[PDB]
Amino acid sequence: SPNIEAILASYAGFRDRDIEGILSGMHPDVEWVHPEGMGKYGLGGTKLGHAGIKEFLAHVPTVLGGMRLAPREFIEQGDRVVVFGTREVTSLRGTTATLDFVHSWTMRDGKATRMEDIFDTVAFHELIES
Numbered sequence: 001s002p003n004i005e006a007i008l009a010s011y012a013g014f015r016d017r018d019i020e021g022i023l024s025g026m027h028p029d030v031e032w033v034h035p036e037g038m039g040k041y042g043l044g045g046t047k048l049g050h051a052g053i054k055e056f057l058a059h060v061p062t063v064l065g066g067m068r069l070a071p072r073e074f075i076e077q078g079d080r081v082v083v084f085g086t087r088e089v090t091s092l093r094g095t096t097a098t099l100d101f102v103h104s105w106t107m108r109d110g111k112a113t114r115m116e117d118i119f120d121t122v123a124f125h126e127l128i129e130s
């Protein structure tokens with residue numbers, strides 16, 4: 001399916017620490033959204049476009065030692081896809097946790113116009129501070 005394979009190309013880019021692969025599913029106008037409760041670490045709110053994603057990704061190593069995604073379920077209807085999964089998150093002190101994620105994708109002409117990450121920010125903060 002065409003929306004799904006563009007989403008997978010992006011997840012593959014993340015797996016391979018490959019920004020070009022990540023953007024290979026994103027529209028230039030894409031909206032990149034993370035919970036407002038990550039504002040304390042400078043990772044909340046909306047970033048715009050390919051440049052905004054790079055800004056976000058350049059900040060992450062300031063907060064975390066590592067992250068690995070495991071998408072598990074894809075629910076699709078139209079230009080919307082919701083992906084449920086887990087991720088391994090490593091703190092700057094080497095502590096590692098498995099946490100849940102939901103990615104809500106909005107597509108058009110085969111690329112993402114919006115990707116929003118929704119997750120338990122308290123549990124995430126607890127990992128960051130451990």
Ligand SMILES: O=C1C(O)=C(c2ccccc2)[C@H](O)C(O)=C1c1ccccc1
Binds near residue numbers: 010069
């Ligand atoms: O690129 C990230 C990112 O770096 C993550 C993150 C890091 C720190 C705090 C909150 C989220 C997400 O784990 C993560 O799903 C993404 C991602 C989503 C879709 C395609 C490619 C990558």
